[PDB]
Symmetry: C3
Subunit: 135 residues, 3 copies
Amino acid sequence: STTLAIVRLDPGLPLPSRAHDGDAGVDLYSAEDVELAPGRRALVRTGVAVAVPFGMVGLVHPRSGLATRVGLSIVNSPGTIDAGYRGEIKVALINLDPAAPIVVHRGDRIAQLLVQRVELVELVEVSSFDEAGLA
Amino acid sequence: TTLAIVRLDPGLPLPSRAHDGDAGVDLYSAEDVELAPGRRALVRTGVAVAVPFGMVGLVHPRSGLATRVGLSIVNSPGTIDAGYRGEIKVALINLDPAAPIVVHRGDRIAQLLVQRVELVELVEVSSFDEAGLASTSRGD
Amino acid sequence: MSTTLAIVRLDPGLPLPSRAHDGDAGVDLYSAEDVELAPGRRALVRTGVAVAVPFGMVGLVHPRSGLATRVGLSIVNSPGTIDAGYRGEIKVALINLDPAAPIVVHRGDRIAQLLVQRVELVELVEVSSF
Ligand SMILES: O=c1ccn([C@H]2C[C@H](O)[C@@H](COP(=O)(O)OP(=O)(O)O)O2)c(=O)[nH]1
Ligand SMILES: O=c1ccn([C@H]2C[C@H](O)[C@@H](COP(=O)(O)OP(=O)(O)O)O2)c(=O)[nH]1
Ligand SMILES: O=c1ccn([C@H]2C[C@H](O)[C@@H](COP(=O)(O)OP(=O)(O)O)O2)c(=O)[nH]1
Ligand SMILES: [Mg+2]
Ligand SMILES: [Mg+2]
Ligand SMILES: [Mg+2]
């Protein structure tokens, strides 16, 4: 229902897509080949940049399959993609397994991007919650 | 908005909301597991849900255990698609350096939130300039 | 936008959290204390603020990506959940995910960011099958 303008910085990757009609997000690909030794991280390029609509927010989540099979994870999950950010999306992958290295290949689905509305609240300082009227 | 839930395992209580405005409901562990420092495990929660179309279920780590024993969830926030009718599982991991964590069946290991999600339609463009979506000053 | 979030600076010594750019998703929270994390160790840090999340909404504590990459800084229970009813101080479960370098956090540093979104306060209805 909502359109998202997306730019394939790396035309060699497939355009991210939604697997089923109600599926929460679209899987992002790795534009590079990387290997993580146990406990090490990396900042991988996905080869895409998005135009998140004002009032919404992009959110990068880890894939559960990999998370369990090989203990693959994202250091700053959920990664926040601001509506204004027009740069390339990057994933902070980390190997949380104790002994087995993870090998990521360019073309691999290494995360998923969800889009949600966000409340751009206005912060209003108060002295106390009682005074304001919130106890 | 109601969420149809099936207790695959009838021995566990039905998840519920502690207070009127609470974001989610704590899910239970249907099994007994012990995690060594740095090890993970996929635990069954004894429940399946029917997240409404246009929405998404989100599995978050409980903060109390997160601090006290360093308990966590590898793919947090876990995504539960509206079409998913399987059992909800939690990828627990022990992030503490030396103390093993013991999960007992009946323990509240995570919490389920439900939020609306934008079912976006991706439309590719060669640049953001033509559509007035360029971050000029911010420089991307 | 029109939704306002009541905030109390428990520690007045810190700046009020703010939004950097117009559509930015959250506001950076500060550390009210000095902490140092050896590799693999965690710490519950005070941010010096308490908020009143509107009913039907939820506060979400996210890790900052810069630090996540440069030094492997993370948050154990990310995304931290702040209930609309919670009126206590916001604390961040920081953890050092780097293998060998200690992370040093200074009071005044921006250690996380708070987002606010609406949440569906669903009513669960048990059914024997789908
Ligand atoms: O990062 C966080 C997460 C939670 N809370 C507080 C506010 C929220 O209302 C309460 C939520 O508790 P929880 O994280 O859901 O779990 P627990 O049951 O372990 O307290 O704890 C914080 O101060 N910081
Ligand atoms: O914490 C979680 C996350 C996901 N799921 C299930 C429900 C969801 O419909 C499906 C999502 O899979 P995913 O996270 O995209 O993983 P992958 O596609 O890598 O299998 O897995 C769970 O039971 N628990
Ligand atoms: O997984 C992620 C997270 C963030 N970003 C970019 C886009 C977003 O708009 C910006 C957000 O910066 P932040 O998370 O506030 O980082 P920091 O404050 O540490 O620089 O960084 C990515 O490309 N990938
Ligand atoms: Mg998937
Ligand atoms: Mg709780
Ligand atoms: Mg920031």
